[PDB]
Amino acid sequence: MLKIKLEKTTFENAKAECSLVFIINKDFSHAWVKNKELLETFKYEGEGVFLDQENKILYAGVKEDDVHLLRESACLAVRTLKKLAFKSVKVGVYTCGANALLENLKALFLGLKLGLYEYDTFKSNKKESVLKEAIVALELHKSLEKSAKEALKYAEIMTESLNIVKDLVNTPPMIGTPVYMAEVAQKVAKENHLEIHVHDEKFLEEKKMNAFLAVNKASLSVNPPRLIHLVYKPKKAKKKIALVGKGLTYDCGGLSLKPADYMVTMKADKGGGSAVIGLLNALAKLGVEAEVHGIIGATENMIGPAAYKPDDILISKEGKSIEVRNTDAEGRLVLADCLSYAQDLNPDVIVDFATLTGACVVGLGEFTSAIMGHNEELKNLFETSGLESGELLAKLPFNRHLKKLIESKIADVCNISSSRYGGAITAGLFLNEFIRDEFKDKWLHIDIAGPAYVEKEWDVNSFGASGAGVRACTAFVEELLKKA
Amino acid sequence: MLKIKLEKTTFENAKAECSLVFIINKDFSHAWVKNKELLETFKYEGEGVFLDQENKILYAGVKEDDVHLLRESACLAVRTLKKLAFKSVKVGVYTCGAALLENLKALFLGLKLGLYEYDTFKSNKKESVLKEAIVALELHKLEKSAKEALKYAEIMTESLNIVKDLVNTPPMIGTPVYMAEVAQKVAKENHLEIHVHDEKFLEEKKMNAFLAVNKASLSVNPPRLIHLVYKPKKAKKKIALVGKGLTYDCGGLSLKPADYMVTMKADKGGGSAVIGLLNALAKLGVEAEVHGIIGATENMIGPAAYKPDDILISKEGKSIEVRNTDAEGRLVLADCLSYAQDLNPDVIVDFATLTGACVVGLGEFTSAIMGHNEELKNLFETSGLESGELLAKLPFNRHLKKLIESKIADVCNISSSRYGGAITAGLFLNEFIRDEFKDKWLHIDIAGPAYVEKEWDVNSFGASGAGVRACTAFVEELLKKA
Amino acid sequence: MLKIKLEKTTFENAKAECSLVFIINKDFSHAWVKNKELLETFKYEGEGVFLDQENKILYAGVKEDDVHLLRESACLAVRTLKKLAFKSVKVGVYTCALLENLKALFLGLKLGLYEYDTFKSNKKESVLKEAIVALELHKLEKSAKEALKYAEIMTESLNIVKDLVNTPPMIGTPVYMAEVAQKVAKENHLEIHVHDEKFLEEKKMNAFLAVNKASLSVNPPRLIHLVYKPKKAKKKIALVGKGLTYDCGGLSLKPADYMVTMKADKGGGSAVIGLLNALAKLGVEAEVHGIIGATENMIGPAAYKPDDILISKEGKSIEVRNTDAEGRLVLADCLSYAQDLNPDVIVDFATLTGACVVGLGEFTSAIMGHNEELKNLFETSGLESGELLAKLPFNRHLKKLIESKIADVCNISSSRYGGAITAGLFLNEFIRDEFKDKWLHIDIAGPAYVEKEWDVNSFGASGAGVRACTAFVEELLKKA
Numbered sequence A: 001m002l003k004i005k006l007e008k009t010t011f012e013n014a015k016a017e018c019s020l021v022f023i024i025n026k027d028f029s030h031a032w033v034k035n036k037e038l039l040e041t042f043k044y045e046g047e048g049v050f051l052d053q054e055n056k057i058l059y060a061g062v063k064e065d066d067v068h069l070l071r072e073s074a075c076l077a078v079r080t081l082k083k084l085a086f087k088s089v090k091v092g093v094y095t096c097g098a099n100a101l102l103e104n105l106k107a108l109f110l111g112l113k114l115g116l117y118e119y120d121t122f123k124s125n126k127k128e129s130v131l132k133e134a135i136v137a138l139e140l141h142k143s144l145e146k147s148a149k150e151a152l153k154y155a156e157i158m159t160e161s162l163n164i165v166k167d168l169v170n171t172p173p174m175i176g177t178p179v180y181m182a183e184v185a186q187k188v189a190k191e192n193h194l195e196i197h198v199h200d201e202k203f204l205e206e207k208k209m210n211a212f213l214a215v216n217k218a219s220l221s222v223n224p225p226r227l228i229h230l231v232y233k234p235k236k237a238k239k240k241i242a243l244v245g246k247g248l249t250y251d252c253g254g255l256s257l258k259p260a261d262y263m264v265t266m267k268a269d270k271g272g273g274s275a276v277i278g279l280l281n282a283l284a285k286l287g288v289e290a291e292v293h294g295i296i297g298a299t300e301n302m303i304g305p306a307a308y309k310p311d312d313i314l315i316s317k318e319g320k321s322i323e324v325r326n327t328d329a330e331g332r333l334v335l336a337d338c339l340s341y342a343q344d345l346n347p348d349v350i351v352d353f354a355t356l357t358g359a360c361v362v363g364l365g366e367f368t369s370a371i372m373g374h375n376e377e378l379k380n381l382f383e384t385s386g387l388e389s390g391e392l393l394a395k396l397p398f399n400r401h402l403k404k405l406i407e408s409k410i411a412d413v414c415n416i417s418s419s420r421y422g423g424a425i426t427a428g429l430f431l432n433e434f435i436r437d438e439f440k441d442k443w444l445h446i447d448i449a450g451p452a453y454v455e456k457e458w459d460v461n462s463f464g465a466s467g468a469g470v471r472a473c474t475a476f477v478e479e480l481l482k483k484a
Numbered sequence B: 001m002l003k004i005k006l007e008k009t010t011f012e013n014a015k016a017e018c019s020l021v022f023i024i025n026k027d028f029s030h031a032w033v034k035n036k037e038l039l040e041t042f043k044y045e046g047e048g049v050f051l052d053q054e055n056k057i058l059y060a061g062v063k064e065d066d067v068h069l070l071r072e073s074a075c076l077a078v079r080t081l082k083k084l085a086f087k088s089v090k091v092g093v094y095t096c097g098a099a100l101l102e103n104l105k106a107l108f109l110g111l112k113l114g115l116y117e118y119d120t121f122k123s124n125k126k127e128s129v130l131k132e133a134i135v136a137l138e139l140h141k142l143e144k145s146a147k148e149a150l151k152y153a154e155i156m157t158e159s160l161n162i163v164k165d166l167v168n169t170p171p172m173i174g175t176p177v178y179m180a181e182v183a184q185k186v187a188k189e190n191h192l193e194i195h196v197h198d199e200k201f202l203e204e205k206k207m208n209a210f211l212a213v214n215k216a217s218l219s220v221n222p223p224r225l226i227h228l229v230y231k232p233k234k235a236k237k238k239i240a241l242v243g244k245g246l247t248y249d250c251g252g253l254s255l256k257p258a259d260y261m262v263t264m265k266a267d268k269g270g271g272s273a274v275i276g277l278l279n280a281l282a283k284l285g286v287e288a289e290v291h292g293i294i295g296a297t298e299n300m301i302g303p304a305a306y307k308p309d310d311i312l313i314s315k316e317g318k319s320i321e322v323r324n325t326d327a328e329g330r331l332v333l334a335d336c337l338s339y340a341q342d343l344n345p346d347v348i349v350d351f352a353t354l355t356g357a358c359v360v361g362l363g364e365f366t367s368a369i370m371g372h373n374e375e376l377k378n379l380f381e382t383s384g385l386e387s388g389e390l391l392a393k394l395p396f397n398r399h400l401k402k403l404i405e406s407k408i409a410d411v412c413n414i415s416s417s418r419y420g421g422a423i424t425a426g427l428f429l430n431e432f433i434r435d436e437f438k439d440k441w442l443h444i445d446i447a448g449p450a451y452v453e454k455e456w457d458v459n460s461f462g463a464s465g466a467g468v469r470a471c472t473a474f475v476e477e478l479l480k481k482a
Numbered sequence C: 001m002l003k004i005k006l007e008k009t010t011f012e013n014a015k016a017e018c019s020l021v022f023i024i025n026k027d028f029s030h031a032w033v034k035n036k037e038l039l040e041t042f043k044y045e046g047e048g049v050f051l052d053q054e055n056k057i058l059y060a061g062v063k064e065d066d067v068h069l070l071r072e073s074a075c076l077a078v079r080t081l082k083k084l085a086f087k088s089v090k091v092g093v094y095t096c097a098l099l100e101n102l103k104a105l106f107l108g109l110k111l112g113l114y115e116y117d118t119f120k121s122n123k124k125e126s127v128l129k130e131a132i133v134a135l136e137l138h139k140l141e142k143s144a145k146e147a148l149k150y151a152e153i154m155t156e157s158l159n160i161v162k163d164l165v166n167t168p169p170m171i172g173t174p175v176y177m178a179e180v181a182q183k184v185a186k187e188n189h190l191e192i193h194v195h196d197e198k199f200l201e202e203k204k205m206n207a208f209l210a211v212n213k214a215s216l217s218v219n220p221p222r223l224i225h226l227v228y229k230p231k232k233a234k235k236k237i238a239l240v241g242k243g244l245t246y247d248c249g250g251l252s253l254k255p256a257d258y259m260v261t262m263k264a265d266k267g268g269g270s271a272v273i274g275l276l277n278a279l280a281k282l283g284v285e286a287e288v289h290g291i292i293g294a295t296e297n298m299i300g301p302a303a304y305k306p307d308d309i310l311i312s313k314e315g316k317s318i319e320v321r322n323t324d325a326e327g328r329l330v331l332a333d334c335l336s337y338a339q340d341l342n343p344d345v346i347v348d349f350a351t352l353t354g355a356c357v358v359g360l361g362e363f364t365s366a367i368m369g370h371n372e373e374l375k376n377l378f379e380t381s382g383l384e385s386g387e388l389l390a391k392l393p394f395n396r397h398l399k400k401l402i403e404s405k406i407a408d409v410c411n412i413s414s415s416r417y418g419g420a421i422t423a424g425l426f427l428n429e430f431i432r433d434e435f436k437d438k439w440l441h442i443d444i445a446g447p448a449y450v451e452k453e454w455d456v457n458s459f460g461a462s463g464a465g466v467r468a469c470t471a472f473v474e475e476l477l478k479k480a
């Protein structure tokens, strides 16, 4: 954890073992640029970072006056400083293109804190960084104390929440079992004084969640499944909100086995479920005025003599029958039954998160999540809020032609499309078949298969897990409640 | 089971139901070529074998004056006679380009290996009428040399055939437990110390890389860590031989295609060779303390299988990012090499059917030698080649070493590149060799010649016993200098 | 280019706009480390480079006390300074034998400026133009100028090869290759013959012609023959290079993943052109012939085919089963041409097999042949010159794998294993008995072109083969 200290003082009078100065749009004119000549001599033009050794100033370029760009640079700066021997760094308050001040303060604070994270638990050479603190001089680069206090609280809560999700998603599958997911949820419940229910395969059987159970059949005797149900219930609740996540702690494809090149990183198939656990932590600690339910269907999708099969026809909890033609479309089966369980809560809003389809990633790229559903106003609110939080998102539209592609000749619906095209969307349309008529205008489906796990550093994300979904959904709920 | 009888007599005065005469480099001039006109009449030009029916003489061609080609020809000759009705064959003593002792070993070994074939499951299996080769101690171009060569031939034939029978055993039968049983027999035969450890011992020693490979099949065929010890009255060196005993390798969750999974019963080639080596080295009575270490397990697929993305803590302590479960042998070896080093040996050699890339690079008939110590690598190569095995050194370099980095562990069990697989596998093993052992270590990748689906040289279809002769010759030459 | 000035002065007294200091094996004790505590403060421990801003000193780490790593670091140091605004750098003399170290430093430094950035719009001229070498030992003048001459010639020669190999295939045609060879011949006053398809027809080089058939009417083939003939020649040496200016695999078409980078299939032929330039400028005492068979291997309605049976110039017939084994067909005929010259030594260079790259990795070339002494000489000399090499052994089992039921030999192996070696054994079929002990085959499929920076090589072409064959020829002549 990078500690951030707010101090009522000029940047110049603040004390720290080094300084951080951002260069926005190649503007080197500010008083905080102490030795402009050194930068010219070594040809620093505001791209990436540059360290003035004599003055111990780290400059960090921000290409455009942009909050999103600010968050990224602040992260890079701390990553850079993490490998050095300075115990502390001081920085002033910036106000880039975004109200604006608060969002700029949030981006600076979160960015800085996120620069310390890397999944290095298993590396033998790992070092504790010397860098422990950032001193924030409450002075404008261009009430401030109140807004900085508000942004620091957000940054503290969101960093913790993001890092919970990332440590879990990054956890290797021999360790990160469904039972392990439940234990992480149990800690979060105890920390936040939440209600938690952890159900097993017998509960699933009693509730007739046979789609969920089918996916688990191969591995039941090794790693039994867990239906994790977290509840945050404050004194004033303006809305009941259900967050449903795909908790696939390992997806090998089942009998429809994945090729080796595609099976690697599937420890991250619990990205959605993990994001939901982090969301209950964030929303509880932010004390939002809503009753929030976190529902995670956790299981592996393994191969073995008891595995569910292409040609199986499963009776969903909702009652509809499902022709299985490919066991590698397992997430939507777990989700079919978890969404059904969710609707039994009679929520006002349902949002599911899932690393659901490769086709989403092909369509949007690795860095962007897809938003699906019927209510355009609701989808727009999630998109607008999520983009502001710094996540990349795109709506994908249903249509009636795609809907026909998941027809089955021998069941009510097929777990794959008859076409090679439109996979993210036909998957969302599969889920729709399990959304009751009275919840169709209250449901969002978010496919985070891309950004939940990426094998390189990008933006505020280190190699591996990113915590995709958490910032966007938090922003969406806050904006939702502001209107209620 | 081909008895060789040495006789103080001329080739002509020796008695047997038929004769074997080698034709070297198409030279038909020798007195032993009894009816030359017959060979002309039927266009025998010294390629392969030809049987003079009236004189009951089998001619066997040796294309060049070469001791290796003589070994091969002797094998082919007996293979030919095995199918006939002569109980005995007589042969003289030959001396091709090598020397006398080397040539006698070639002849006697070649002849004995001619009888071997894996026909255990054939319903039309026939026992051979051919039982003996009478060797007339007369030079084509001694008794002390012949005796010494016969001893080697007898021990090496037995040793190679132990290994070949084990490697050829199909996987339903040839389990890790089965390997341990064969090791027990060899230990009992040679009065060796033997330890057979199970998964509980593996857990105690934190050999989690080894354990991970076995997890899919633990409840079906549990793993075995086999440890043989030969300890002579005089021991000039302490030598640890480490073998990959993968009794089946389906690739795990990173499942092999069907065309590539067939023959993987032979993924126990390296561990099997180590078992045969303890037999050979004990009976030869070499002046070295020899440890044979075999990590035996299957690599199966199932709901408890270890996975791409698993990160395993090796016994040595280094963490391993698994990105492909079909790179399993190097995990088992990482832990078996750690166990080996705790013995503080002077020399460590490992044998493994480890990479397809080795076979692509060298061909199916040649094993790769890797390591740091050039004198030690050269000694294995020269000794090995002299013993009749085909070998090649493959060099490490710093560029290949970077390719097994991991972003989230100390090392990755696969390379980032499609190129140089045999050598990056070697460099993976290197990460588990302590500094104080790096100049005492050889890695031998026998993925090619350990199992080949045709007859070649002195090798029948299937298992060849690769690594046994070469490592024997290496140890003998090593003890000469000590 | 990077000018190197040798100056008889101390490192301290030498003048340049910045300094270069090597840190060998994390030894920071030397006088030239001007401000130690700065390195401590910023956790520089001698890996990669570090720039002392105040003193304008670039430190470059050398992990071990090794001449090869010195070569590498020197290159990295200059790549680093190239992006900066200093016009000159000064460096002392290092010894990680003295001649060998001086050659590595000077070559290393000069190779630091090479990038294939011809088609980049943002390319800007470098400020860095000179390295001032203070003739003072870290731990001489005659060795320095000897190493400087080598470095200058070898940098020129390597960059000739890399520019050519890097040239994209629409431009880098067989005619274009012959043009680069014409420039090298004119520069060095060499004898040069450039033959076309009519000459190939007359010489019955039908294996070569077959590969060219698809694209004859677009880019005709060229047989390039350079001759260096000095006043004193102790040996006659033929250097034979595969000049496939593009290899799409022909009818046996390559998938997209594998076709990209095949502009570099002229790696071997390009290496031979650079060799002739190096060996002539070094004035070695040997008559050296450089023979390059240049053509594309394209697909089209006139393409040669799997099932074609070709009559080589040597006379042996070849069953084609895969048109993507085209290099060995060009080489079969070029080797025949080479042997007619009655050389004492023949070395061929070719980016010939993927199997070689699979077996050895991308950074190492394979050496094949019969004469162990000749192979050991090439290997040892090449390793000292800074190239990574391995010998691959023939054997009789592999030789059987290229038999044909309907021709004298097949242009592919019947097995998926041992491809670099069975390719060598295919070439062997066209080497006369009287040349078999005078022949080396070098498969540079790996390091001739690599899509990243490594050692002294920038992205793309490396100039593989040139340094090693130069060192081998120089060492060969010592024995004569």
Ligand SMILES: CC(C)C[C@H](NC(=O)[C@@H](O)[C@H](N)Cc1ccccc1)C(=O)O
Pocket: A251, A269, A326, A328, A329, A330, A331, A355, A356, A357, A358, A359, A361, A415, A416, A417, A423, A449, A450
């Ligand atoms: C078989 C298809 C109909 C469905 C299939 N979906 C899956 O395999 C999901 O279970 C995968 N978990 C989807 C995924 C892909 C890439 C990165 C993260 C997650 C897909 O390929 O999209």
Ligand SMILES: CC(C)C[C@H](NC(=O)[C@@H](O)[C@H](N)Cc1ccccc1)C(=O)O
Pocket: B249, B267, B324, B326, B327, B328, B329, B353, B354, B355, B356, B357, B359, B414, B415, B421, B447, B448
């Ligand atoms: C996944 C790859 C990085 C490693 C993989 N290696 C293996 O599958 C080994 O376990 C095989 N047992 C190696 C082998 C290949 C061919 C013949 C005999 C033995 C290989 O393909 O070489």
Ligand SMILES: CC(C)C[C@H](NC(=O)[C@@H](O)[C@H](N)Cc1ccccc1)C(=O)O
Pocket: C247, C265, C322, C324, C325, C326, C327, C351, C352, C353, C354, C355, C357, C411, C412, C413, C419, C445, C446
């Ligand atoms: C068809 C095979 C017998 C031969 C085939 N060889 C070729 O395609 C050569 O013409 C290629 N030019 C060899 C090559 C491969 C990879 C990188 C650099 C160079 C090969 O794949 O090795």
Ligand code: NA
Pocket: A366, A449, A450, A451, A452, A453, A454
């Ligand atoms: Na992803």
Ligand code: NA
Pocket: B364, B447, B448, B449, B450, B451, B452
């Ligand atoms: Na094999």
Ligand code: NA
Pocket: C362, C444, C445, C446, C447, C448, C449, C450
């Ligand atoms: Na290459």
Ligand SMILES: [Zn+2]
Pocket: A251, A253, A301, A327, A328, A329, A330, A331
């Ligand atoms: Zn799946």
Ligand SMILES: [Zn+2]
Pocket: A248, A251, A269, A330, A331, A355, A356
């Ligand atoms: Zn999945």
Ligand SMILES: [Zn+2]
Pocket: B249, B251, B299, B325, B326, B327, B328, B329
């Ligand atoms: Zn394997």
Ligand SMILES: [Zn+2]
Pocket: B246, B249, B267, B326, B328, B329, B353, B354
């Ligand atoms: Zn294996």
Ligand SMILES: [Zn+2]
Pocket: C247, C249, C297, C323, C324, C325, C326, C327
């Ligand atoms: Zn080709």
Ligand SMILES: [Zn+2]
Pocket: C244, C247, C265, C324, C326, C327, C351, C352
């Ligand atoms: Zn080619």
